[PDB]
Write a protein that binds this ligand. Structure first.
Ligand SMILES: *Cc1c(COP(=O)(O)O)cnc(C)c1O
Ligand SMILES: *Cc1c(COP(=O)(O)O)cnc(C)c1O
Lengths: 392, 401
């Protein structure tokens, strides 16, 4: 066994669709990107979707639309990927980190209330492993602190509150109380990066739920303008703002079209693998995050586990013992304050003890659609034997 | 029959290379991007090349490596594409626009000297249509104003002068006094966008000429770090069998090139000398066609320059703004797509809103007023060129009194 962590799942159907684009007159943004956006909108139950070159691009663009900028604050969990936070610093806003709960990755929503100020413009929860956050709660928090809010831009007037922007890089296809991810938070960004559930090798999207206060075409145009240098017998164009360059090509969209056709089948397989893993670890010290709750049906992107009674050293040893057995594994995630970039900005790990405690004993097992049932069986058994073995 | 301005030139060889990447374990950055960077470095005579997802990305990262920022100034010509200027505002620097000469797109190098201040960190000349700028002159200017300069970052100490950063979006393959574009200016960004000479549909690169004061590996690593979220991994974690552990040194960007785009680039680069030759043949046919007429093309062959021949920029003698715009619409009625390179930056809403005023760059405006760009791409047949030549001549004269 040599089990990789997240190989891409690409078949001939994807290759023929890309080849088709390469024989067309449209190799960058064109008809298949528009078609992809249409079909993703239907899938996520949103009116419009903007397809871009990364989820990092989408998330940033969302901030840029809301015109979040210097002196504004944006709240992120301490336990997340660097990308959710980096974009806050790109627009010149100030990140505010919120520690997490004891038995989940989700922010402590009391600490979230306490973190909110008159500067607070946006909250970016992360839908880690595909597991969507407690949005009933999150929407209660922003309504509750709604008098703190003052709208300093066009779109901030439309909402008269903190905008909730979902980092659903892991959560295309997840649902919360039966609704698709993308239709829950005010804005949502998705990732189609090589290692994600749905891939275009590099890509992503921004979308937003139906809301009477948003003209959808106008919002789409605004995203488009910012993604293509601010540009608006037809030679003549103007440039309204010296903007960015993060459009999606029809090469990536071709991949996306086919992935989206195959996607219900990929999800089902990831359900089967997660359920086998779940049975395997029941009764053991290995405690997976739950992909099926009363409110959530996860996309089942990552098999996040934590090992009861493991220290930092013991965890790091377990991972290296897993690789000796031919099992690649990962850690999601170092809390942001462990990272040099965020220490240099004054964030300190001792302020987020729960985030640190989640990270210390966390191990992510392979969860992708090229795993065989026998490989899963092998992972279950080896992980159990290796954990117990890590001993003195 | 209807002639497009810039269709992409893609063959089966490109398609088989992309398919090959799509069957590999590497669909984003991987072995073919590294190989592309290696082969482009050889082609441009530079030690290293960083392949990215746009020339806009490359140009901005060059500025971010030089740590050009708030309170610094960066000089660009008034006659250029918005991308050359936008990246200045992205790093928080202040753009300074310089008007151009009377008979070419190049900046007026006297006005350039006059524009330079103690804040001036970078000059971004544009190699318009593939025509490389007068770099002997440009380097004379920055040496001449070298006492104005004070170095407020690591790489600004390495140079102790204004850094010259070539916008060669149009100029992969162009040469200035026999040297490739990329080896002339201090840094150079290239574009592999769909409509460019060499395409990856979307893409580009940053490179830099050999200079004793630059550790090339260190400069590469710095670009790489900024293109991939600031992520690094130490020697220890890389050696370990499970190499999970990484640090993030700076909350950086996301503009790496995939091996899908690199696959395109590898094949394009093989086919490139042949694409260049064809663009030479088309330009020469056009050149003969317009000789003696009121249609005046920019020259792709000078005593110092052999252009890549990316755009057939022309200006029509004695045409006003209205007459030009009418000529272009008459060209489309005849089935000939055409374009304008470029509206001077100060005509654009974004740059007016930042206080730039068109009346300060009268030569830039005068270049734009009567400029028309004809199709110049490797899907044009000789008969289509013949047709363009004749129609453009007849339509221009038609537009009389
Ligand atoms: C991968 C990832 C992103 C950014 O995705 P890209 O498409 O690579 O920009 C953002 N957030 C999270 C949680 C991720 O895992
Ligand atoms: C197209 C272009 C750019 C930027 O190219 P991308 O690869 O689209 O970022 C920059 N400068 C000039 C002159 C261009 O034509």
């Amino acid at each position: 066994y040599n089990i990789p962590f997240s190989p891409p799942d690409i078949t001939e159907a994807e290759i023929t669709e890309v080849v088709d684009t390469l024989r067309s007159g449209w190799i960058t943004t064109g008809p298949k990107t528009k078609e992809l956006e249409r079909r993703l909108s239907l899938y996520t139950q949103t009116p419009k979707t903007v397809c871009l070159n990364s989820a990092t691009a989408a998330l940033e663009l969302i901030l840029r639309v809301l015109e979040v900028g210097p002196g504004d604050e944006v709240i992120v969990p301490a336990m997340t990927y660097t990308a959710s936070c980096s974009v806050i610093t790109h627009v010149g806003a100030t990140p505010v980190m919120v520690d997490i709960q004891a038995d989940t990755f989700e922010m402590d929503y009391d600490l979230l209330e306490q973190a909110i100020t008159e500067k607070t413009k946006v909250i970016i929860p992360v839908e880690l492993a595909g597991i969507v956050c407690d949005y009933d709660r999150l929407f209660q928090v922003v309504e509750k602190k709604r008098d703190f809010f003052t709208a300093s831009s066009k779109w901030q007037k439309a909402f008269n509150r903190i905008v909730i922007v979902s980092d659903s890089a892991h959560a295309l296809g997840s649902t919360y109380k039966g609704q698709p991810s993308g239709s829950i938070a005010d804005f949502t960004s998705f990732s189609f990066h090589a290692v994600k559930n749905f891939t275009t090798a590099e890509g992503g999207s921004a979308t937003w739920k139906a809301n009477p206060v948003i003209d959808d075409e106008e919002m789409y145009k605004e995203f488009q303008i910012l993604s293509l240098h601010g540009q608006t017998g037809s030679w003549e164009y103007d440039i309204v703002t010296p903007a960015y360059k993060c459009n999606m090509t029809d090469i990536m969209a071709s991949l996306g079209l086919v992935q989206l056709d195959r996607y219900p089948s990929l999800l089902q397989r990831r359900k089967d693998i997660v359920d086998r893993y779940d049975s395997g670890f029941a009764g053991s010290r290995i405690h997976p995050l739950a992909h099926k709750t009363e409110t959530v049906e996860s996309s089942r992107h990552l098999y996040i586990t934590r090992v009861e009674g493991a220290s930092l050293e013991e965890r790091n040893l377990i991972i290296q013992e897993l690789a000796k057995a031919g099992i690649a594994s990962n850690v999601h995630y170092k809390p942001l304050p462990l990272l040099t970039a965020y220490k240099n900005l004054g964030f300190d790990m001792t302020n987020y003890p729960k985030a640190y405690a989640f990270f210390e004993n966390e191990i992510t097992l392979p969860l992708h659609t090229k795993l065989s049932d026998e490989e899963v069986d092998y992972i279950i058994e080896t992980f159990k034997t290796v954990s117990e073995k890590v001993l003195t």
